[PDB]
Amino acid sequence: RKLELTKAEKHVHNFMMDTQLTKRVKNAAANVLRETWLIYKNTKLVKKIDHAKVRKHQRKFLQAIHQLRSVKMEQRKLNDQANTLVDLAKTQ
């Protein structure tokens, strides 16, 4: 098969994996204002539910949640997930 594969034929940004090139969103985050990932002390168990497997724990679990049933991603797919129409304008 003398075709396909080995994509890219221009080459660009072939850094060593990452040499301080891929920065944030302009370090505009700083401390996300809330700086919850900075103020936190002793503990830090505060995050948007749903992230890991999450199984038996305190209270048994059931199906019809977010397990199984996935033979085709099908329409409705996420990857970016973002929305801000009340920014750089309404600050208070």
SS3 43: strand
Q: How was this structure determined?
A: NMR
Decide: residue 92, CB within 10 A, 0-12 exposed, 13-18 middle, 19+ buried: exposed
CA 27/CA 86 separation, integer angstroms? 20
Name residue 30's amino acid: A
Query: What total of structural domains would you count in the chain?
Result: 1
CB 61 within 8 A of CB 55: yes
Domain residues for 2?
1-92
Q: What is the CATH number of the domain that holds 69?
A: 1.10.287.70
What are the C-alpha distances in Å from 58 to residues 47, 51, 54?
18, 18, 11
CA distance 54 to 61: 9
